[PDB]
Each structure stands twice: as structure tokens, then as C-alpha cells.
Amino acid sequence: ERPTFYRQELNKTIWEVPERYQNLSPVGSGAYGSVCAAFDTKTGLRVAVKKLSRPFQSIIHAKRTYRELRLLKHMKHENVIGLLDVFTPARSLEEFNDVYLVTHLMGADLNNIVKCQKLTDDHVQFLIYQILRGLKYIHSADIIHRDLKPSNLAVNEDCELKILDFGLARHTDDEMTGYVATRWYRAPEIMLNWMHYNQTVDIWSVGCIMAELLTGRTLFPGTDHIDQLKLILRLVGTPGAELLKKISSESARNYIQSLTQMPKMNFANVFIGANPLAVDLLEKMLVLDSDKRITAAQALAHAYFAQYHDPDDEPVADPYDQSFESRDLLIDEWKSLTYDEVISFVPPPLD
Numbered sequence: 001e002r003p004t005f006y007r008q009e010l011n012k013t014i015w016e017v018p019e020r021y022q023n024l025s026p027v028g029s030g031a032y033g034s035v036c037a038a039f040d041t042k043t044g045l046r047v048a049v050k051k052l053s054r055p056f057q058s059i060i061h062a063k064r065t066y067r068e069l070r071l072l073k074h075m076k077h078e079n080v081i082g083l084l085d086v087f088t089p090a091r092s093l094e095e096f097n098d099v100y101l102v103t104h105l106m107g108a109d110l111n112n113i114v115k116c117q118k119l120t121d122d123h124v125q126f127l128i129y130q131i132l133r134g135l136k137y138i139h140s141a142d143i144i145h146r147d148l149k150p151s152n153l154a155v156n157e158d159c160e161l162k163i164l165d166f167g168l169a170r171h172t173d174d175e176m177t178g179y180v181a182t183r184w185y186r187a188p189e190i191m192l193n194w195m196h197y198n199q200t201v202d203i204w205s206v207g208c209i210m211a212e213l214l215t216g217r218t219l220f221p222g223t224d225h226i227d228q229l230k231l232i233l234r235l236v237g238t239p240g241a242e243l244l245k246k247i248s249s250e251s252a253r254n255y256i257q258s259l260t261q262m263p264k265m266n267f268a269n270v271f272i273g274a275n276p277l278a279v280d281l282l283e284k285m286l287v288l289d290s291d292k293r294i295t296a297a298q299a300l301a302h303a304y305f306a307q308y309h310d311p312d313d314e315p316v317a318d319p320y321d322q323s324f325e326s327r328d329l330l331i332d333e334w335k336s337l338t339y340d341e342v343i344s345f346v347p348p349p350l351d
């Protein structure tokens with residue numbers, strides 16, 4: 001049965017949500033979208049409720065709305081955002097116009113724990129173990145996060161971790177310009193558009209994250225794209241002929257060859273005092289040639305995580321059809337597709 005909704009103005013927009021959800025107040029800072037924290041009286045959980053802004057204004061927006069909902073409906077893993085609820089005040093497709101998504105209230109992200117608290121090597125094991133576990137699941141559904149950084153990683157007081165915010169509304173050229181965390185964790189091949197990328201790009205982001213937990217400092221805080229490439233190549237060495245061949249972007253390949261050849265540095269001298277096993281993993285994550293990176297599944301078996309590795313408890317995802325991605329539909333067609341996904345939503349099992 002359809003619940004009763006109540007209406008309230010919450011920062012310039014009218015939120016219409018089911019009565020179960022009480023005590024809504026704006027959260028983040030406008031940084032996650034229109035997000036409210038709330039109390040869910042049916043489950044006793046503190047939740048974040050996102051109302052999607054103008055979800056069907058264009059074909060791009062309609063498809064994006066469909067994308068996000070699809071993705072969040074699929075994800076059922078301890079180390080990944082799960083969809084608690086999705087709803088609309090609309091009793092029909094004709095009145096359908098707003099989508100609302102509900103997940104667990106985050107509270108703290110990984111910047112908060114790196115900036116404000118001090119991390120033992122065993123915290124870094126556990127934190128990275130969990131990112132890689134959720135990544136194994138995601139990548140097994142041929143999903144690519146593309147935007148892993150500390151700020152879309154939720155951590156609770158027990159240092160338990162979720163991957164959130166698949167970053168779905170891709171970034172503006174301007175958001176990616178200058179001295180910004182939005183670019184510091186990106187694999188070189190996407191930052192500079194060297195080749196058709198793939199899921200190996202997230203492993204690079206993991207390396208950057210792991211180095212910063214170990215050191216307390218950003219691995220490659222470039223003042224811009226080029227300055228950041230320089231930081232990267234200084235640590236990792238300039239590419240060889242093998243990696244150059246793979247760079248499809250003739251222009252990008254011609255630029256790299258302008259640079260003076262540099263050898264890969266000794267990570268034991270970069271990460272002084274670090275656990276040798278941490279250093280060894282880092283060397284295998286932070287590989288310029290992405291074909292040669294350690295995968296999430298290979299990385300879970302790495303000796304650094306022996307404390308936590310259980311191969312009978314590192315699950316894969318059900319198959320994820322994203323054939324819709326290469327599909328050209330009109331606004332109303334995406335919109336109806338979305339509406340059906342709202343209507344078919346089944347809540348997660350109760351404990």
C-alpha cells in the first residue's frame with residue numbers, strides 16, 4: 001500500500017516524503033546535492049534522503065537519473081552504499097517528476113579520519129582491505145567507480161567503510177582545474193585522456209588513498225594537470241616504449257616524449273618507516289601501465305592483508321546489464337524506464 005506523504009520547504013525546495021521519515025534537516029553543505037538527514041521510524045535508522053534536482057529536464061539528465069537508480073538498486077555489499085528506499089509522491093507516470101533516494105547516514109568520510117585522527121598500520125590494512133573488497137564486488141559487475149577519493153568513502157566509529165557516490169554526474173572541466181582534490185586521485189590515463197580507460201583506474205585511486213593514510217599527506221597534490229603528471233612520473237618513472245605504443249592520443253604521447261626520462265624511485269625511501277608489505281603493494285598499485293596493475297581480487301590475496309583476508313567472504317556481484325548505456329531514447333522513455341525501477345523497488349530484508 002502507498003504511504004501518506006507530508007510536504008515541507010527545506011532550503012528553497014518543497015520536500016514531499018512518507019511520514020516514516022521524520023526530522024529532516026539539510027546535510028553536507030549542498031555538496032552531495034539536495035540531501036537531508038532524517039530519522040526513519042519504521043527501521044530506527046538514521047538515513048540520508050536525496051531528492052534529485054530536475055531529474056528529467058534533458059535526455060542527458062533523464063538517462064543519468066536512470067543510471068543512478070539502476071546502479072544503487074544493484075549494489076548489495078557491506079562495503080558499498082545500499083539503497084534503503086526510493087520513492088515518489090506521484091500516483092502515476094503522468095504526474096511522475098521527482099525521485100528521492102534513501103541510504104544510511106554517513107556522518108564521517110575518510111578525509112575526516114585522515115585529517116583528524118592518527119592511523120596505525122593495522123587501521124590502514126583494514127581501511128584499504130575494505131575498499132578493495134567492495135571494489136572486487138563492483139568490478140565483478142563490470143562497474144567502474146571512476147571517482148574514488150577519501151570524500152566518497154564513509155567510515156563509522158568502528159572504522160567500518162562504505163564506497164559511496166559513484167560520482168555519477170561527471171565533472172566539469174572547471175571542477176577539475178588547478179589545486180583540487182577532485183583530480184589528485186585520478187589515474188593518469190583518464191586525467192590526460194591517453195586511451196580508452198577501464199576498471200584499473202580505481203586501483204590507482206586506491207594507491208593514492210593508501211599512501212595518504214600511511215603518510216597523512218596527499219600523494220600527488222598537483223597545482224594542475226601538468227604539474228600533477230610531473231609528480232606522478234617523478235615517483236613512478238617516465239613511460240617506456242611499451243606504454244607509449246598503448247597511448248592512442250597522438251598528442252598526449254608526443255607531450256610525454258618531451259619530458260626528460262626518469263627512473264621509478266625507491267618507495268622504501270619515499271614511504272620511510274612504512275611496513276615493507278605496504279610498500280610492495282603500493283609498487284603494484286601505482287604502475288603507470290594499467291594493464292600491469294594489481295587488480296582488486298589479486299590485491300585481497302596480498303600478504304599485507306593476511307589479518308583480514310577471507311576468500312570465502314569476498315563476494316562478487318550478480319550480473320549487471322548496462323546495455324542501456326549505448327541506447328538512444330527520448331526523455332519520456334528514460335523517464336518511464338526510471339518510473340518502473342521506482343515501482344519495482346523492494347526494500348532490504350529486515351534484521
Ligand SMILES: Nc1ncccc1OCc1cccc2ccccc12
Nearest residue numbers: 032048050101102103104105106107
Ligand atoms: N549517506 C550519506 N550520509 C550523509 C551524507 C551524505 C550521504 O550520502 C549522500 C548520497 C550520495 C549518493 C547517493 C545517495 C542516495 C541516497 C542518500 C544519500 C546519497
